[PDB]
């Protein structure tokens, strides 16, 4: 499955995975630390 | 178009029998009385409305007159019969089948 | 499956007009040939007079029945006839300046009649011919507008 | 009793009429098509198919004409039921 | 035999090695990127299968398997809708009280404060009020449970897996040969008799056995839990006989041609169910039976393998006249050899069909409690109208693609296509003239009325009071269809629609459907519609007929279907391409259907939709379409400005997403104007001045940054224009009609 | 010649070649009664030149607009010639500040 993992390394798939990751990280940060208007913690 | 150098004047190959025969093929069945018209006919009711609307000649028929239904249906069938008769006659004389 | 109707123009498939019933039906050709526009031997002033009478008479109706004073009983017809007179005057002006602009180059190719015989150019399509045509159009159009008013006044069944 | 009804006789008459019209050269069959002008002419049959009849009347022909006659008879039955003639 | 199954066995190896090589399908993209134009071309050429190869067999195989993929995706989408109705819905609550509970089948997660969109729709439920009509469709099918929706979702996922397997199978394992696709006679026989005939017959059976009894009990006040399940109606004939006595006689009346016995569940009532405001499902069942028979006889028309039937080639080659030369000779080859021709015809008729569906589903609401869900009704009309317009513009596009690529003058000599190309100047000149005449005598009427109303002369307007332009032909047709059960359809009990005339059907105090009166404003707006349609036709037909050649560019076919221009010469040849005629026909289809749906929204909110508080109907806007739709200022004031008070004041509500998408669609629309008003030469120079700054800091990419191609600039512009405008109208419509209706 | 055997190019007949045809023109000299034609050739005798016709048009149009503004607009009973016949929108400047 060298070719399949080459496909997963393509720009659109890697972009989808990375932005799902970034968006999920931000979403979980905003779930556990809701409404962060200022850096106070 | 290797033919047709001068737009032949007889572009409609006229048969004077064609209009008469389409008129008779439509209006005679259109003079058959049926159950839906109350025993009357399409041509009969159409002419009856023509008379009822010629009784006030300037005043045209109304929107609720039923003269327009008879008019449009009668002429649908009549124009169709006449054009299909012309087509059939000129296809019979010519090829086309 | 014979007898095709639509033909190339004068049998020339490369000029590009496609003679057709609406173009070359003998009734249509006759009617269009009998119009004063296509009476190439008649003086352009008289053809202009006829055309102008027709047009001045016809274009008064809209101004009469649909103008701004259409709902005033005796004023509708006067106002419409005068609007039509003004429009006819403007059109005569436009015709004059068209005759000034168009007829300066004197085309050199001759004309035929879809039969083979070359005819002379219409004197209408010259400076003098178009000037007299526009004069005739003005006279006839004002006359036809006046006659449109007269018909508003004298026709029995005018509403 | 349906067998003997007007509906039953109409239907059998219509189906047998279409079957006899096809078998005896009065209706288009598998072996005989029609031209633009409705004149029966030999077809190519697009497969070739075997029947021992003297006329080459296939069971495909029996199916086609049974369907045609069933449509005819259904229309006739229900139109006589419509105008009240049944 | 000639009509047979014909396939290649294992034509294509199932392997991931071409996934790892983007642009394998092209010889111009297999060389890898050097510029970003490659990245865009890889997506523009992905489904242009006739530019990958040139033999029709592989093209057709790719098309077949891609259709299987599309069907699998549609099945995923349908299973998702059914699943969201089974899990994230208020459907079981909505069945018990459909006149007060807002249908909702989407719940929002409480993450960034967006749980405000989970509105109080009813039924002890918080979610997004849907406008899809799925609740009414499910009630018409007789669902009455979330378990049935869940199992329909599972079946849809199974069918999606089946479709994807079938695509893989019919491309990689057993792919049909070209002679199998060119069996258009058998394809039509099966798609008429089987796809539409057996399909309509099966749905008629469902309606006989499941929908009709379930909805007859639902309309009788029976709670959905007390209703027998569909299999209890299938097994027990006594229950069905208790609901419809004709079931006591069995299927004997069908075979004895005593079909009138079935007049209990096969009716011709016409009109609407007064309990639900939808069509009688008995009429619907009879309808589906009738068209099933009709399509099953229609699917026995074409000759496939036995002598009976028609050869479509013979029909075509026999249809010719004195005006049309050889006639339809050479069209069978066109439509059996070119996929784009088939796509043109099929998209044209499919879009016209979607618009017809839109017009027929609002006037004859086929689903229960659909007519009084004004949001569902408006959204369905708007949606299917838009889909139809898009399909029609695509029909123009692919007709042009055929003319450029697959057209051959050898097979078309003096036939209808040759003779259309040979007098295209007359066609387009008369279309131009009628477009100008219609534009004047439609929009200049609005300008005349605006000028008169501004000048203080309302007696000079084209209004129902001053200068009446009454649509007397449409009024006559209305009156004729209203009086049809009396003379010309005597076995129908009522007219097809209440829009022809008569009394209103009120369901839950709200008007389901009521007579639509046509006046001067309707005349004017219908002629506006005709105008915009004629101009869209002008653009697309001019792109089709002038796709190969013109008096400006005689060798336009060699430049292709999709090219920016020929140059700044001949005065400038920008957008001479047929692709650019599609690009402009898109703008004009948008401008047409925007007015279509605006006319629908205002006419419905003014003259149909409303409440029956006392004896007397209070419409939503108050009946102001008659006197205010005469002017542009009326459409701006009394429709756009007035009805925007619900989308701009939606902040802090469950409709706040609609205001947000209103603003964002405005933004996207205006952003389209950067691509439409501009050109590539500015952006390439800006990009190179930016590439300087990237080269200075050693971050210049190896894939050289290019500006979007001219064609791609136009495509991006029109895509963003359509998206912004349509989503703006979407938000405006939905925020308005969820509040006021 | 030009119609012989699909020979649609003739150097000695460039009228038929270029399609220079009068498709509907007839050169018959006889259309109108001669007294009527005389009447209308003499009625237009003064304005049959461009300058004379434009002088007539200028005189007539200027006189017409001037008599329309001076007399004809009031004869037509135009609202702009009658005046407001009311106090008008004088004291109602704005909804807030009712200015004159
Ligand atoms: C030469 C025959 C003729 C004449 C003189 C008129 C004359 C008239 N018609 Mg009639 N009409 C005619 C033929 C004619 N019409 C035909 C063939 C049809 C079809 C109509 C349909 C028709 C309608 C529907 C109406 C008129 C109306 C009218 C009046 C205004 C227009 C005017 C008195 C209008 C009227 O005054 O009432 C009107 O409403 N006409
Ligand atoms: C001689 C036998 C016979 C008789 C007496 C009838 C009698 C009837 N038929 Mg039947 N029919 C017959 C043979 C017969 N049919 C056959 C052989 C066929 C097969 C082709 C049919 C197929 C058929 C159909 C499919 C329908 C009828 C219908 C009807 C009824 C009304 C038709 C009408 O006025 O529509 C008047 C229609 C118009 C004036 C215009 C219609 C235009 C359409 C909608 C647009 C295209 C009438 C009771 C109709 C029916 O049962 O309705 C109750 C119907 O729908 N017939
Ligand atoms: C047209 C297809 C379609 C669409 C647009 C949606 C859209 C949605 N689904 Mg649904 N769904 C679908 C098909 C679809 N679904 C099908 C076919 C199934 C059955 C397998 C489901 C089963 C399903 C469940 C079980 C849930 C959703 C949920 C959701 C929401 C969030 C999904 C998410 O965060 O993804 C995340 C994506 C990545 C991390 C990548 C969203 C509204 C969730 C929801 O609405 O919660 C309230 C939820 O819990 N979906
Ligand atoms: C794992 C199974 C598998 C494998 C290994 C292959 C392998 C191959 N296929 Mg086959 N194929 C399969 C399944 C498979 N296919 C199925 C299930 C179908 C039916 C749809 C097809 C239909 C098919 C056709 C019609 C063609 C191929 C082609 C190919 C070749 C390259 C395809 C490529 O570049 O893929 C990479 C491509 C993708 C990953 C795109 C997948 C797109 C999916 C189907 C739709 C998803 C849409 C998505 C929901 C949109 C979201 C929008 C977003 C904004 C949310 C290669 C030999 C092509 C070829 O030339 O072969 C020689 C060709 O023409 N295949
Ligand atoms: C009764 C037989 C029959 C039926 C029902 C269909 C149905 C269909 N065909 Mg057609 N087709 C047939 C015979 C049939 N075909 C024949 C004989 C040929 C050869 C000439 C073709 C050639 C053909 C082509 C070339 C294409 C189609 C396409 C389609 C689909 C169009 C999309 C649609 O309407 O979605 C409606 C969707 C449904 C109703 C969902 C149910 C789908 C079922 C499971 C498939 C239908 C049964 C299948 C044809 C028989 C094989 C069963 C399988 C288990 C082996 C549709 C499913 C198009 C398509 O989308 O391809 C995928 C397409 O491109 N067909
Ligand atoms: C596709 C559409 C469809 C379907 C599936 C059905 C199905 C049914 N209808 Mg409906 N119906 C329909 C359309 C349909 N109808 C339409 C259009 C009308 C209007 C005319 C009606 C009007 C109607 C009435 C008025 C009645 C029905 C009834 C029935 C039922 C009795 C079936 C029967 O006697 O026929 C006979 C059918 C068969 C003999 C086929 C069975 C074949 C099986 C499946 C073979 C499988 C064997 C297998 C090879 C071996 C076993 C497998 C394994 C265990 C080893 C059945 C549930 C009757 C009923 O009781 O309803 C509750 C009834 O009274 N229907
Ligand atoms: C049955 C429907 C159908 C089918 C099968 C095709 C098939 C085809 N079309 Mg046709 N087309 C259709 C409908 C259809 N089209 C319609 C409705 C239109 C009008 C809009 C067009 C207009 C059109 C043009 C103008 C052209 C084609 C071309 C093509 C070919 C290649 C398309 C391609 O590679 O794009 C691959 C897919 C994409 C590039 C994706 C496009 C994404 C769009 C622009 C955005 C919309 C997405 C979404 C709805 C918006 C929200 C997204 C969100 C993330 C913001 C292919 C033969 C081209 C062709 O043949 O070239 C020679 C061509 O030039 N088509
Ligand atoms: C709709 C008005 C069509 C008018 C009409 O009745 O045309 C009917 C006329 C009939 O032509 P034919 O009988 O030769 O056509 C035979 C058919 O089998 C098509 O080949 O069509 C044409 O002449 C070409 C289209 C003219 C289109 C003119 C538009 C005005
Ligand atoms: C052996 C033989 C014989 C006899 C035979 C027989 C007797 C046969 C029969 C046959 C038959 C007896 C057939 C039948 C068929 C039928 C069919 C084929 C049916 C069909 C049906 C259908 C198709 C339906 C349809 C429909 C419906 C369901 C509904 C309504 C509409 C319609 C109509 C569409 C002879 C002569 C002696 C001699 C030798 C040989
Ligand atoms: C919704 C949906 C779903 C489901 C669906 C279904 C469930 C369907 C079904 C369907 C069906 C369930 C169908 C059926 C059909 C049937 C049929 C179609 C039948 C027919 C019959 C006939 C045609 C007959 C004929 C005849 C007669 C009449 C008598 C004797 C002889 C003979 C046999 C010839 C799913 C999950 C996918 C998902 C998506 C959506
Ligand atoms: C704005 C504009 C541009 C410039 C637009 C650029 C070139 C396209 C930008 C698309 C995206 C932003 C670039 C894609 C880069 C990566 C794929 C994104 C991945 C990383 C992100 C997180 C940044 C044109 O090239 C153009 C050409 C012809 C007519 C009009 C116009 C036009 O209006």
Curated annotation (Swiss-Prot), chain A:
UniProt-annotated location(s): Plastid, Chloroplast thylakoid membrane
UniProt keyword terms in alphabetical order: Chloroplast, Membrane, Photosynthesis, Photosystem I, Plastid, Thylakoid, Transmembrane, Transmembrane helix
Any GO BP: photosynthesis
Pfam families, per the entry: PSI_PsaJ
Residue ranges crossing the lipid bilayer per the database entry: 7-27
Bilayer topology annotation: Single-pass membrane protein
Domain of life the protein comes from: Eukaryota
Any GO CC annotation of this UniProt entry: photosystem I
PANTHER family in UniProt: PHOTOSYSTEM I REACTION CENTER SUBUNIT IX, PTHR36082
Annotated function: May help in the organization of the PsaE and PsaF subunits.
Recorded family membership: Belongs to the PsaJ family.
Protein name stated in the entry: Photosystem I reaction center subunit IX
Source taxonomy: Eukaryota, Viridiplantae, Chlorophyta, core chlorophytes, Chlorophyceae
Gene (name only): psaJ
UniProtKB/Swiss-Prot annotation, chain D:
Transmembrane feature ranges: 2-22, 59-80
Keyword Secreted appears in the UniProt entry: no
GO cellular component terms attached to this protein's record: chloroplast thylakoid membrane; photosystem I
Major subcellular site: plastid
Keyword Mitochondrion included in the entry's annotation: no
Subcellular location as annotated: Plastid, Chloroplast thylakoid membrane
GO biological process, one term: photosynthesis
Cystine pairings recorded for this chain: none
Membrane topology category: Multi-pass membrane protein
Key words of the record: Chloroplast, Membrane, Photosynthesis, Photosystem I, Plastid, Thylakoid, Transit peptide, Transmembrane, Transmembrane helix
Family under the similarity heading: Belongs to the PsaG/PsaK family.
Annotated protein name in UniProt: Photosystem I reaction center subunit psaK, chloroplastic
Species this chain originates from: Chlamydomonas reinhardtii
Range within the parent protein: 28 to 113 of 113
From Swiss-Prot, chain E:
Outcome, altering residue 666 to S: Accumulates approximately 50% PSI
EC number: 1.97.1.12
Main location (coarse class): plastid
UniProt-reported outcome of changing residue 666 to Q: Impairment of P700 function. More severe
Binding site for phylloquinone: 683
EC category name: oxidoreductase
Superkingdom to which the source organism belongs: Eukaryota
GO annotation (BP), single: photosynthesis
Task performed by this protein: PsaA and PsaB bind P700, the primary electron donor of photosystem I (PSI), as well as the electron acceptors A0, A1 and FX. PSI is a plastocyanin/cytochrome c6-ferredoxin oxidoreductase, converting photonic excitation into a charge separation, which transfers an electron from the donor P700 chlorophyll pair to the spectroscopically characterized acceptors A0, A1, FX, FA and FB in turn. Oxidized P700 is reduced on the lumenal side of the thylakoid membrane by plastocyanin or cytochrome c6. Both potential cofactor branches in PSI seem to be active; however, electron transfer seems to proceed preferentially down the path including the phylloquinone bound by PsaA.
Subunit record text: The PsaA/B heterodimer binds the P700 chlorophyll special pair and subsequent electron acceptors. PSI consists of a core antenna complex that captures photons, and an electron transfer chain that converts photonic excitation into a charge separation. The eukaryotic PSI reaction center is composed of at least 11 subunits.
Protein name (database record): Photosystem I P700 chlorophyll a apoprotein A1
Swiss-Prot record, chain F:
Domain of life per record: Eukaryota
Keywords: Chloroplast, Membrane, Photosynthesis, Photosystem I, Plastid, Thylakoid, Transit peptide, Transmembrane, Transmembrane helix
Membrane topology: Single-pass membrane protein
Residue span of region Disordered: 75-100
Predominant place of localization: plastid
Any one Gene Ontology BP term: photosynthesis
Compartments (UniProt record): Plastid, Chloroplast thylakoid membrane
Positions of transmembrane segments: 55-73
A cellular-component GO term for this protein: photosystem I reaction center
Its job: Possible role could be the docking of the LHC I antenna complex to the core complex.
Family: Belongs to the psaH family.
Name this polypeptide is given: Photosystem I reaction center subunit VI, chloroplastic
Source organism per UniProt: Chlamydomonas reinhardtii
The gene coding this protein: PSAH
């Amino acid at each position: 499955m060298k070719d399949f993992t080459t496909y997963l390394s393509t720009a659109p798939v890697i972009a989808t995975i990375w932005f799902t990751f970034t968006a999920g990280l931000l979403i979980e940060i905003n779930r556990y630390f809701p409404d962060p208007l200022v850096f106070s913690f | 178009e290797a033919s047709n150098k001068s737009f032949p004047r007889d572009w409609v190959k006229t048969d004077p029998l064609v209009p008469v025969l389409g008129f008779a093929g439509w209006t005679i069945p259109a003079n058959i009385g049926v159950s839906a018209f109350g025993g009357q006919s399409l041509f009969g009711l159409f002419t009856q409305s023509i008379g009822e609307n010629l009784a006030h000649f300037p005043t045209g028929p109304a929107l609720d007159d039923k003269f327009w239904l008879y008019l449009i249906t009668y002429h649908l069938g009549l124009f169709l019969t006449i054009t299909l008769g012309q087509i059939g006659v000129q296809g019979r004389k010519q090829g086309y089948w | 499956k014979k007898a095709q109707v639509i033909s190339p123009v004068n049998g020339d498939p490369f000029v590009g007009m496609l003679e057709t019933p609406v173009t070359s039906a003998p009734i249509v050709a006759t009617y269009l040939s009998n119009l004063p526009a296509y009476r190439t031997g008649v003086a352009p002033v008289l053809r202009g007079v006829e055309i102008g009478l027709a047009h001045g008479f016809l274009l008064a109706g809209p101004f009469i029945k649909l103008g701004p004073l259409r709902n005033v009983p005796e004023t509708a017809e006067i106002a419409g006839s005068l609007s039509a007179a003004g429009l006819v005057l403007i059109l005569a002006l436009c015709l004059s300046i068209y005759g000034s602009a168009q007829f300066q180059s004197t085309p050199s190719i001759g004309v035929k009649t879809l039969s083979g015989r070359s005819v002379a150019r219409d004197p209408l399509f010259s400076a003098d011919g178009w000037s007299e045509f526009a004069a005739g159009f003005l006279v006839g159009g004002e006359a036809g507008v006046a006659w449109a008013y007269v018909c508003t006044q004298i026709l029995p069944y005018y509403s | 009793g349906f067998i003997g009804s007007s509906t039953n006789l109409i239907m059998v008459a219509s189906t047998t009429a279409t079957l006899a019209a096809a078998r005896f050269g009065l209706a288009p069959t598998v072996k005989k098509n029609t031209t633009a002008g409705l004149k029966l002419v030999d077809s190519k049959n697009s497969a070739g198919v075997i029947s021992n009849d003297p006329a080459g009347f296939t069971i495909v022909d029996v199916l086609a004409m049974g369907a045609a006659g069933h449509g005819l008879g259904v229309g006739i039955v229900l139109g006589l039921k419509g105008i009240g003639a049944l | 035999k000639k009509v047979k199954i014909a396939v290649d066995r294992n034509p294509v190896e199932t392997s991931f090695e071409k996934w790892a090589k983007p642009g394998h399908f092209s010889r111009t993209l297999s060389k890898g990127p050097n510029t970003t134009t490659w990245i865009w071309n890889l997506h523009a050429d992905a489904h242009d299968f006739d530019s990958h190869t040139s033999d029709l067999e592989e093209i057709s195989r790719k098309v077949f398997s891609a259709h299987f993929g599309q069907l699998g995706i549609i099945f995923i989408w349908l299973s998702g809708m059914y699943f969201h109705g089974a899990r994230f819905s208020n459907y079981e609550a909505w069945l018990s009280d459909p006149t007060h509970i807002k249908p909702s089948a989407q719940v929002v997660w409480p993450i960034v404060g967006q749980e405000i969109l989970n509105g109080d729709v009813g039924g002890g439920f918080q979610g997004i009020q849907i406008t899809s009509g799925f609740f009414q469709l499910w009630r018409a099918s007789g669902i009455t449970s979330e378990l049935q929706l869940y199992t329909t979702a599972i079946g849809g996922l199974v069918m999606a897996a089946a479709m994807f397997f079938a695509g893989w199978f019919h491309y990689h394992k057993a792919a049909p040969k070209l002679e199998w696709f060119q069996n258009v006679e058998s394809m039509l026989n099966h798609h008429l008799g089987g796809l539409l005939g057996l399909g309509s017959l099966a749905w008629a059976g469902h309606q006989i056995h499941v929908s009709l009894p379930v909805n007859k009990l639902l309309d009788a006040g029976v709670d959905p839990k007390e209703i027998p399940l569909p299999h209890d109606l299938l097994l027990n004939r006594a229950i069905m006989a208790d609901l419809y006595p004709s079931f006591a006689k069995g299927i004997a009346p069908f075979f004895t041609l005593n079909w009138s016995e079935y007049s209990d569940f096969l009716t011709f009532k016409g009109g609407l169910n007064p309990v639900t405001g939808g069509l009688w499902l008995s009429d619907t069942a009879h309808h589906h039976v009738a068209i099933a028979v009709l399509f099953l006889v229609a699917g026995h028309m074409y000759r496939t393998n036995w002598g009976i039937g028609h050869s479509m080639k013979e029909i075509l080659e026999a249809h010719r006249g004195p005006f049309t030369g050889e006639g339809h000779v050479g069209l069978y080859e066109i439509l059996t050899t070119s996929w784009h021709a088939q796509l043109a015809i099929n998209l044209a008729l499919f879009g016209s069909l979607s618009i017809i569906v839109a017009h027929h589903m609002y006037a004859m609401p086929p689903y229960p409690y659909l007519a009084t869900d004004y949001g569902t009704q408006l959204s369905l009309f708007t949606h299917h109208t838009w889909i139809g317009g898009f399909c029609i513009v695509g029909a123009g596009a692919h007709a042009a693609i055929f003319m450029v690529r697959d057209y051959d003058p050898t097979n078309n000599y003096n036939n209808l296509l040759d003779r259309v190309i040979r007098h295209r100047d007359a066609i387009i000149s008369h279309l131009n003239w009628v477009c100008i005449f219609l534009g004047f005598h439609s929009f200049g009427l609005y300008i005349h009325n605006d000028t008169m109303s501004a000048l203080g002369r309302p007696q000079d307007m084209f209004s129902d009071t001053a200068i009446q332009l009454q649509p007397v032909f449409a009024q006559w047709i209305q009156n004729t269809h209203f009086l049809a059960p009396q003379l010309t359809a005597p076995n129908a009990l009522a007219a097809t629609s209440l829009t022809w005339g008569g009394d209103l059907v009120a369901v839950g105090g709200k008007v389901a459907m009521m007579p639509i009166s046509l006046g001067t404003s309707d005349f004017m707006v219908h002629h506006i519609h005709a105008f915009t349609i004629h101009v869209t036709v002008l653009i697309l037909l001019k792109g089709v007929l002038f796709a190969r050649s013109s008096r400006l560019i005689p060798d336009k076919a060699n430049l292709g279907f999709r090219f920016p221009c020929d140059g700044p010469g001949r005065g400038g040849t920008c957008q001479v391409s047929a692709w650019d005629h599609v690009f402009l026909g898109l703008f004009w289809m948008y401008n047409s259907l925007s007015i279509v749906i605006f006319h629908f929204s205002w006419k419905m909110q003014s003259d149909v939709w409303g409440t029956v508080t006392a004896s007397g109907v209070s419409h939503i806007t108050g009946g102001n379409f008659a006197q205010s739709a005469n002017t542009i200022n009326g459409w701006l004031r009394d429709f756009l400005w007035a009805q925007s008070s619900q989308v701009i004041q939606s902040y802090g509500s469950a409709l706040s997403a609609y205001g947000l998408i209103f603003l964002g669609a405005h933004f996207v629309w205006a952003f389209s104007l950067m691509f439409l008003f501009s050109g590539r030469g500015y952006w390439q120079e800006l990009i190179e001045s930016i590439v300087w700054a990237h080269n200075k800091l050693k971050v210049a990419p190896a894939i050289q940054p290019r500006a979007l191609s001219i064609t791609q600039g136009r495509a991006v512009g029109v895509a963003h224009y359509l998206l912004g405008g349509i989503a703006t109208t979407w938000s405006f419509f939905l925020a308005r009609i969820i509040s006021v209706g | 010649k030009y119609g012989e055997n699909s020979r649609y190019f003739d150097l000695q007949d460039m009228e038929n070649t270029t399609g220079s045809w009068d498709m509907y023109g007839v050169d018959e000299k006889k259309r109108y009664p001669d007294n009527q034609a005389k009447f209308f050739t003499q009625a237009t005798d003064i304005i049959s030149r461009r300058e004379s016709l434009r002088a007539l048009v200028a005189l007539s149009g200027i006189a017409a607009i001037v008599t329309y503004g001076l007399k004809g607009a009031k004869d037509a009973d135009l609202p702009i010639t009658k005046g407001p016949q009311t106090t008008g929108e004088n004291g109602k400047g704005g909804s807030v500040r009712s200015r004159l």
